[model samples]
Target: HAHLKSATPAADSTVAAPADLRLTFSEGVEATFTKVSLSKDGTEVAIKGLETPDADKKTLVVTPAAPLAAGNYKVVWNAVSVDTFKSNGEYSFKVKK
Candidate 1:
Protein backbone atom coordinates (compact mmCIF):
# COMPACT_ATOMS: atom_id res chain seq x y z
CA HIS A 1 0.00 0.00 0.00
CA ALA A 2 1.08 3.58 -0.66
CA HIS A 3 0.94 5.18 2.73
CA LEU A 4 1.16 8.95 2.97
CA LYS A 5 4.64 9.85 4.09
CA SER A 6 4.42 13.67 4.20
CA ALA A 7 2.59 16.69 2.91
CA THR A 8 3.12 20.33 1.97
CA PRO A 9 1.58 22.77 4.47
CA ALA A 10 1.88 19.61 6.57
CA ALA A 11 -0.75 18.09 8.80
CA ASP A 12 -2.00 20.48 11.50
CA SER A 13 0.27 23.31 10.29
CA THR A 14 -0.66 26.93 10.00
CA VAL A 15 0.70 28.89 7.02
CA ALA A 16 -0.18 31.15 4.15
CA ALA A 17 -2.44 29.63 1.54
CA PRO A 18 -0.24 27.52 -0.66
CA ALA A 19 -0.31 27.56 -4.45
CA ASP A 20 -0.43 23.79 -4.56
CA LEU A 21 -0.85 20.71 -2.40
CA ARG A 22 1.82 18.01 -2.45
CA LEU A 23 1.66 14.49 -1.11
CA THR A 24 4.60 12.15 -0.97
CA PHE A 25 4.04 8.48 -0.42
CA SER A 26 6.13 5.52 0.64
CA GLU A 27 5.78 4.05 -2.87
CA GLY A 28 4.93 5.19 -6.33
CA VAL A 29 1.20 5.78 -6.91
CA GLU A 30 -0.89 5.62 -10.04
CA ALA A 31 -2.31 9.03 -10.97
CA THR A 32 -5.23 7.45 -12.76
CA PHE A 33 -6.28 5.62 -9.60
CA THR A 34 -5.44 8.27 -7.05
CA LYS A 35 -8.04 10.68 -5.78
CA VAL A 36 -7.56 13.94 -3.85
CA SER A 37 -10.10 16.42 -2.62
CA LEU A 38 -10.19 19.61 -0.53
CA SER A 39 -12.87 20.96 1.76
CA LYS A 40 -13.38 23.74 4.28
CA ASP A 41 -16.06 23.69 6.93
CA GLY A 42 -17.78 20.79 5.22
CA THR A 43 -17.94 22.46 1.83
CA GLU A 44 -15.81 21.12 -1.01
CA VAL A 45 -13.32 23.38 -2.71
CA ALA A 46 -12.53 23.23 -6.40
CA ILE A 47 -9.10 22.11 -7.54
CA LYS A 48 -7.17 21.21 -10.62
CA GLY A 49 -6.64 17.48 -11.17
CA LEU A 50 -3.62 15.75 -9.68
CA GLU A 51 -0.28 15.70 -11.44
CA THR A 52 3.00 13.91 -10.83
CA PRO A 53 6.06 16.00 -11.53
CA ASP A 54 8.59 13.22 -11.04
CA ALA A 55 8.87 10.09 -13.13
CA ASP A 56 8.86 8.02 -9.97
CA LYS A 57 5.29 9.15 -9.22
CA LYS A 58 5.84 9.11 -5.49
CA THR A 59 4.66 12.69 -5.15
CA LEU A 60 1.24 13.95 -6.20
CA VAL A 61 0.32 17.62 -6.70
CA VAL A 62 -2.87 19.63 -7.09
CA THR A 63 -3.64 23.34 -7.32
CA PRO A 64 -6.81 25.06 -6.20
CA ALA A 65 -8.94 26.46 -9.02
CA ALA A 66 -8.92 29.72 -7.06
CA PRO A 67 -6.90 31.12 -4.18
CA LEU A 68 -7.80 29.50 -0.90
CA ALA A 69 -9.50 31.60 1.74
CA ALA A 70 -8.33 31.93 5.31
CA GLY A 71 -9.63 29.06 7.38
CA ASN A 72 -9.05 25.50 8.35
CA TYR A 73 -8.89 23.22 5.33
CA LYS A 74 -9.03 19.48 5.10
CA VAL A 75 -7.43 17.26 2.50
CA VAL A 76 -8.64 13.78 1.75
CA TRP A 77 -6.61 11.46 -0.40
CA ASN A 78 -6.84 7.92 -1.72
CA ALA A 79 -3.78 6.47 -3.38
CA VAL A 80 -3.29 3.23 -5.27
CA SER A 81 0.25 1.94 -5.37
CA VAL A 82 1.97 0.66 -8.48
CA ASP A 83 1.38 -2.85 -7.20
CA THR A 84 -2.36 -2.07 -7.07
CA PHE A 85 -2.79 -1.80 -3.32
CA LYS A 86 -4.82 1.06 -1.88
CA SER A 87 -4.40 3.50 0.97
CA ASN A 88 -6.50 6.46 2.06
CA GLY A 89 -6.19 9.20 4.69
CA GLU A 90 -7.10 12.75 5.58
CA TYR A 91 -5.31 15.75 7.11
CA SER A 92 -6.03 19.32 8.02
CA PHE A 93 -4.15 22.65 7.94
CA LYS A 94 -4.95 26.23 8.69
CA VAL A 95 -4.42 29.13 6.30
CA LYS A 96 -3.45 32.29 8.12
CA LYS A 97 -5.51 35.39 7.49
Candidate 2:
Protein backbone atom coordinates (compact mmCIF):
# COMPACT_ATOMS: atom_id res chain seq x y z
CA HIS A 1 0.00 0.00 0.00
CA ALA A 2 1.00 3.63 -0.50
CA HIS A 3 2.15 5.02 2.80
CA LEU A 4 1.59 8.74 3.08
CA LYS A 5 3.34 8.75 6.43
CA SER A 6 6.71 7.02 5.95
CA ALA A 7 6.72 6.15 2.26
CA THR A 8 7.10 2.47 3.00
CA PRO A 9 5.29 -0.27 1.02
CA ALA A 10 4.24 -3.72 2.19
CA ALA A 11 2.06 -6.78 1.47
CA ASP A 12 0.68 -9.99 3.03
CA SER A 13 0.18 -13.68 2.17
CA THR A 14 3.76 -14.87 2.14
CA VAL A 15 2.34 -18.38 2.53
CA ALA A 16 0.37 -20.70 0.28
CA ALA A 17 -2.14 -20.10 -2.48
CA PRO A 18 -5.50 -18.65 -3.31
CA ALA A 19 -7.63 -18.09 -6.41
CA ASP A 20 -7.66 -14.36 -5.73
CA LEU A 21 -5.26 -11.78 -4.25
CA ARG A 22 -5.96 -8.78 -2.08
CA LEU A 23 -4.45 -5.43 -1.07
CA THR A 24 -5.33 -2.70 1.37
CA PHE A 25 -4.93 1.04 1.38
CA SER A 26 -4.84 3.44 4.31
CA GLU A 27 -7.68 5.31 2.70
CA GLY A 28 -10.63 4.87 0.39
CA VAL A 29 -10.43 4.03 -3.29
CA GLU A 30 -12.03 5.33 -6.45
CA ALA A 31 -13.61 2.07 -7.43
CA THR A 32 -13.68 2.86 -11.12
CA PHE A 33 -10.07 3.93 -11.29
CA THR A 34 -8.04 1.24 -9.63
CA LYS A 35 -5.62 -1.21 -11.21
CA VAL A 36 -3.85 -4.41 -10.18
CA SER A 37 -1.41 -6.68 -12.01
CA LEU A 38 1.07 -9.50 -11.56
CA SER A 39 4.47 -9.92 -13.14
CA LYS A 40 6.94 -12.78 -13.10
CA ASP A 41 10.60 -12.03 -13.70
CA GLY A 42 9.58 -8.75 -15.32
CA THR A 43 7.03 -10.41 -17.58
CA GLU A 44 3.28 -9.92 -17.33
CA VAL A 45 0.97 -12.80 -16.52
CA ALA A 46 -2.65 -12.88 -17.54
CA ILE A 47 -5.01 -12.35 -14.62
CA LYS A 48 -8.75 -12.33 -14.05
CA GLY A 49 -8.21 -8.61 -13.41
CA LEU A 50 -9.00 -6.32 -10.46
CA GLU A 51 -12.15 -5.66 -8.52
CA THR A 52 -13.33 -3.32 -5.73
CA PRO A 53 -16.16 -4.30 -3.48
CA ASP A 54 -18.37 -1.55 -2.13
CA ALA A 55 -18.11 -2.77 1.43
CA ASP A 56 -14.51 -2.28 2.47
CA LYS A 57 -13.74 -0.68 -0.85
CA LYS A 58 -10.20 0.10 0.21
CA THR A 59 -9.21 -3.44 -0.54
CA LEU A 60 -8.06 -4.33 -4.04
CA VAL A 61 -9.22 -7.68 -5.37
CA VAL A 62 -7.06 -9.46 -7.93
CA THR A 63 -8.36 -12.66 -9.49
CA PRO A 64 -5.65 -14.62 -11.22
CA ALA A 65 -5.98 -15.91 -14.75
CA ALA A 66 -4.39 -19.21 -13.74
CA PRO A 67 -3.08 -20.97 -10.70
CA LEU A 68 0.34 -19.63 -9.72
CA ALA A 69 3.14 -21.94 -8.71
CA ALA A 70 5.47 -21.78 -5.72
CA GLY A 71 7.74 -18.85 -6.52
CA ASN A 72 8.27 -15.13 -6.26
CA TYR A 73 5.70 -12.78 -7.69
CA LYS A 74 5.15 -9.06 -7.94
CA VAL A 75 1.88 -7.11 -7.52
CA VAL A 76 1.60 -3.69 -9.05
CA TRP A 77 -1.25 -1.29 -8.35
CA ASN A 78 -2.53 2.25 -8.70
CA ALA A 79 -5.46 3.67 -6.75
CA VAL A 80 -6.93 7.11 -6.74
CA SER A 81 -9.83 8.58 -4.85
CA VAL A 82 -12.60 11.01 -5.73
CA ASP A 83 -10.47 13.66 -4.03
CA THR A 84 -7.96 13.34 -6.83
CA PHE A 85 -5.13 12.25 -4.58
CA LYS A 86 -3.41 9.43 -6.42
CA SER A 87 -1.26 6.63 -5.05
CA ASN A 88 0.72 3.74 -6.51
CA GLY A 89 2.90 0.85 -5.28
CA GLU A 90 4.17 -2.69 -5.75
CA TYR A 91 5.04 -5.55 -3.40
CA SER A 92 6.25 -9.13 -3.56
CA PHE A 93 4.25 -12.20 -2.62
CA LYS A 94 5.02 -15.90 -2.86
CA VAL A 95 2.51 -18.50 -4.02
CA LYS A 96 2.93 -22.06 -2.89
CA LYS A 97 1.55 -24.88 -4.94
Candidate with maximal lDDT: 1
Off by over 4 Å in 1: none
Report the number of the highest-TM-score candidate: 1
Candidate 1, 3-96: lDDT as tens digits: 9889998999999989899999999999887998899988999988788899899999978999999999999999889889999999999999
Can you tell me which runs of candidate 2 are displaced by over 4 Å?
Answer: 1-13
How accurate locally, in lDDT, is each candidate?
Answer: 0.91, 0.65
- In model 2, which range of ten residues has the least summed lDDT? 1-10
Q: How does each model score on TM-score? A: 0.96, 0.75
Clash pairs for candidate 2: none
Question: What is candidate 2's lDDT per residue for 15-84, written digit by digit as tens?
Answer: 6666677666677666567766688667887877466675756666677788776777887777775465
